[PDB]
Symmetry: D3
Amino acid sequence: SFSNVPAGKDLPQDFNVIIEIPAQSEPVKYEADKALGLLVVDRFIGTGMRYPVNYGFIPQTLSGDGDPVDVLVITPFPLLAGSVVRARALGMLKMTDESGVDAKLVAVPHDKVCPMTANLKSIDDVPAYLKDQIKHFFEQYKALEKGKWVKVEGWDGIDAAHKEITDGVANFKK
Amino acid sequence: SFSNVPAGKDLPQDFNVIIEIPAQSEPVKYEADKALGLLVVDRFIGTGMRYPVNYGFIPQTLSGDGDPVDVLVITPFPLLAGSVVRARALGMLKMTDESGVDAKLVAVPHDKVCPMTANLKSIDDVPAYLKDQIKHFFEQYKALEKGKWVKVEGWDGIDAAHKEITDGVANFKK
Amino acid sequence: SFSNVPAGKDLPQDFNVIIEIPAQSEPVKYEADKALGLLVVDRFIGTGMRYPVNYGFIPQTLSGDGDPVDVLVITPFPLLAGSVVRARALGMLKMTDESGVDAKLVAVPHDKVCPMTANLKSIDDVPAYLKDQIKHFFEQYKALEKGKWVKVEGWDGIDAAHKEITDGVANFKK
Amino acid sequence: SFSNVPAGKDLPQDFNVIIEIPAQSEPVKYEADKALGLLVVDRFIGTGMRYPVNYGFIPQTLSGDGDPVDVLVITPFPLLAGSVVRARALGMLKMTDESGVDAKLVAVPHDKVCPMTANLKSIDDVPAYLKDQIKHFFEQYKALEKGKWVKVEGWDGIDAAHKEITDGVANFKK
Amino acid sequence: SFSNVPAGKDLPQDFNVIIEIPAQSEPVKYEADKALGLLVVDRFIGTGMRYPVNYGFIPQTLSGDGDPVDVLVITPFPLLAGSVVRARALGMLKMTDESGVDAKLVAVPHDKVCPMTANLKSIDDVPAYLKDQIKHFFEQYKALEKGKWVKVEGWDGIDAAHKEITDGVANFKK
Amino acid sequence: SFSNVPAGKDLPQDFNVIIEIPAQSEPVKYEADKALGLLVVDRFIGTGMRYPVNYGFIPQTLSGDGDPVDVLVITPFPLLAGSVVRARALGMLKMTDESGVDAKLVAVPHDKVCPMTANLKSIDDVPAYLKDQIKHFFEQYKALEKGKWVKVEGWDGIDAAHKEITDGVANFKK
Ligand SMILES: [K+]
Ligand SMILES: [K+]
Ligand SMILES: [K+]
Ligand SMILES: [K+]
Ligand SMILES: [K+]
Ligand SMILES: [K+]
Ligand code: NA
Ligand code: NA
Ligand code: NA
Ligand code: NA
Ligand code: NA
Ligand code: NA
Ligand code: NA
Ligand code: NA
Ligand code: NA
Ligand code: NA
Ligand code: NA
Ligand code: NA
């Protein structure tokens, strides 16, 4: 299943995201097992906080931590966990957590998939209130797990997102 | 996954439907990718309109357009996207859209799966209000996508549904 | 999919459960098809009654009836149907139904997956009201299906749960 | 609020129902307080069972037990708790419980409010599966409360419903 | 209840809206009864179509048709039916229906109530896709009721909204 | 409506709570207007955080800030906004915010209303994970509103809750 989905139709700018956690879903952290082809319950989020936007990963990528490249996808209605969405990048949130460096991309679907998000061209177009909510979420969601923490370094734009994607694709192929 | 599900236990009258879109779900059009084994987001429906009944397809069939045979399944509670339901036919809605001829079957589950729908023997037993809603849905849901349109030709009964199924099974095997 | 998930990381006490029916979901009985890798609609529950806790099975086990070992998993929020949860046993409900002996385990997730349930050490820690609801559910949910019935024999503890799991693993390997 | 709503525009056949419990709502029994004008939590249902159809009462009536006349209203989507619906009668369920005789009417909205239910002319038109679910609900929902019980005597038709309504209106005026 | 809520703290620009229909709620048209103080079920929408944004009215106003001034309020999450929201105007949709002229205002909450909508200053700031959905909704939702119809004339801005509000307040006082 | 509900049947230990915000509801802060008898939208919570338990107030009380006494009510399913629940106290959370001292009670329903919570006798019986979530919620929910802040001082028990209630009742009567 998950293992055979292409990273994208035209990398890095035209990529695929497998959804693990729908926006506003009850506070349960699922992670795709690429060796089982199934979503696995990683943990019940200690704080009870919910992802403000959809969360998933790009298949066939391997990030700095040995996990696939992480992606937040903004949509007008939550997406189904375990579904695939063709997406494009807006930018990224840079952070470090208990396991070291942690960048997450911020994306929207392809314009023909989601006309509603077509006018979001870069991270600067995302409403400030949403940006602020995403940043608060990552700063606070691990507050009640011993040994876990997050510091947000800052936002970066589309070119940085594309580097992260090209690196991830390369690293995965070895 | 999807590719290996049989078209049915006793074709054409006793067939399987893989669900893509639960009745009344938020207005997001998923399509099964039979080569990925996963549901893929085709588009956010432009009008925000919702399927009035469950929508899916018969696996191992190939309709006139090169897609599997499409099915609307009526149930007392929505079905899970990506699940399989053993079904029987009531009839069909005949239409033409921007890509040519487009028939969709109307079905209910097998009587032992859904005793609640056992008294629906043919399309004529479906409440007129539901029939009318389904027809309005197909007439209007594509209203806000350029280049897309639908004209409803009319309803047909169980024998026409069975032909569509037998043709689809034959065509798929080449 | 389902067929390749291990029964557990350290049997019998540390096992995996694939979820078929989320706690409080609409009254539709799904069963995993291990040969299709998909959830299948077994039936619309005749009484309209809902599982009071999550329901699923241990993969790679084979119980007395030729089905995998059944498990009720208690969580603070319902789990996703078709997901996998690492679990530990609390005890079991002993019953006989129309097809003979029927034991179901009662479990919670691993403590690092669900800290919220860490203080449930055995079946005796489960609130009496929940115990009573589970027992009423099994006594009544089949009331409206001809030829189906259930008598509850009683509760048993962790050691009995572990026997059921070890037997199931052994039986599956032939 | 509740106290000033008329029992109906043309009694007994054209009456009003104030909704206390939406069909399929979580298992919490609300009762309108006509002296507070507010819904009050009577109890968490011990069995966790849910009303299969909407439940409420006719204002300005006084039944045999000193409570207003009780009504089950069938609709295609649940109604809002605390809302008012213009309705007509289909029949009634006769029962006795721990507090003596207990009849409940079965109704649908006025035809111009709910065209979808226009073809239900009497209790005999209600699907058998729904009838059976309603009867099971009342037989079982109090199973886990000490001192509470219900025996179902049987169904009766529109004329009996109308008597119950005329009596209730008369009794309320003293 | 409803009858005593002020039309606004500083008319016409700072006004109150009582919500009758939450955005995306199941397709049931409630109307506030100002003489009962309660929401009343007007009808089950024939097409099954849902309001794309919250819908309600300004209390203590009387529009051209003898009903209070109608308002669509855009929010990031649906509002509770029967609740009150302090709002400001963006513009209006002009229409005529079976009962003659029908203008509906488009509004957002006060900036301190909803910071998320602060950057919407006029109707021109509303995304085109949302504008298009609202217009499609009114063009189509009455399609299945005999004797009912709607033609959309066009959009107008904040000053026209304010006139409609001042007229409504004046007309209500006689 | 709200203004005429008694503070309780036997104060301070047997009191009434009017619910403003159901546990886990979308992140919108409603406040009862006792002069309108209606729920009013105070604000969209800036952080998007949700109340982990039901939130409301005791009618006919007047706390140190000039608002009624605030109460968190723990239940197995969320309660309806605007409903009334007979409750008993477990303890209280002591805090100071931007407007000075701020104590909130923690309660459960009367034992006959909610048998499921009967074994919670005091604040010390509440699971630590829930206690921790409630405290995190109040520490963080106002993070994104300028001029607003909260420091948690600590927990206190049933006797302190009862003082707060007796003071509130006295203060309200002048
Ligand atoms: K490229
Ligand atoms: K055949
Ligand atoms: K072991
Ligand atoms: K009459
Ligand atoms: K003014
Ligand atoms: K006392
Ligand atoms: Na990362
Ligand atoms: Na991380
Ligand atoms: Na087709
Ligand atoms: Na088509
Ligand atoms: Na079993
Ligand atoms: Na069984
Ligand atoms: Na009665
Ligand atoms: Na009764
Ligand atoms: Na109007
Ligand atoms: Na109109
Ligand atoms: Na306070
Ligand atoms: Na405060």
